[PDB]
């Protein structure tokens, strides 16, 4: 599958992360990201997708080696880590037919897995509106502990 690139934006306290909420198949909350165009460099794709979904330009803030990358069902997703963005920043998507809402979430309150259905003796996982964000949460928490303390 085509690689995706975007960002994990944190505030100045490093407590909170910025998630966006799409529509339909993308109806839950997730980090801003999208598919790379032909010949486009990973940092440029990240900035483009982030600016389209949030109105915030990360290009002056990206650090090349500061990202979390996950391969999920043989598609690679790389989110550049962008700390220190003020919580009073005004975010507005360009793509308002694609983005319902944009919010800060407490990192410590976000799930890092979905819940099973063992109460009901049924296989699988319960729905969770943070499905797309979840795979990045534990790697983010570990990354912040190493790089800040
Ligand atoms: C299958 N699926 C994907 C998501 C997701 O990515 N959500 C955040 C988001 C990112 C970018 C845009 Cl444009 C819209 C929403 C949710 N469920």
Swiss-Prot record:
Expressed in brain and testis. Not detected in heart (at protein level). It is found in: Cytoplasm, P-body; Nucleus. Phosphorylated at ser-249 in a MTOR-dependent manner. Changing residue 53 to Q: Strongly reduced decapping activity. Residues 1-131 form the Nudix hydrolase domain. Mn(2+) binds at residues 49, 53. A motif (Nudix box) lies at residues 34-55. Decapping metalloenzyme that catalyzes the cleavage of the cap structure on mRNAs. Removes the 7-methyl guanine cap structure from mRNA molecules, yielding a 5'-phosphorylated mRNA fragment and 7m-GDP. Necessary for the degradation of mRNAs, both in normal mRNA turnover and in nonsense-mediated mRNA decay. Plays a role in replication-dependent histone mRNA degradation. Has higher activity towards mRNAs that lack a poly(A) tail. Has no activity towards a cap structure lacking an RNA moiety. Found in a mRNA decay complex with LSM1, LSM3, LSM4, EXOSC2, EXOSC4, EXOSC10, PARN, XRN1, CNOT6, UPF1, UPF2 and UPF3B. Forms a complex with DCP1A, EDC3, DDX6 and EDC4/HEDLS, within this complex directly interacts with EDC4/HEDLS. Interacts with DPC1B. Interacts (via N-terminus and C-terminus) with TRIM21 (via N-terminus and C-terminus). Associates with polysomes. Interacts with LIMD1, WTIP and AJUBA. Interacts with DDX17 in an RNA-dependent manner. Interacts with ZC3HAV1. Interacts with APOBEC3G in an RNA-dependent manner. Interacts with ZFP36L1 (via N-terminus). Interacts with NBDY. Belongs to the Nudix hydrolase family. DCP2 subfamily. This is m7GpppN-mRNA hydrolase. It comes from Homo sapiens.
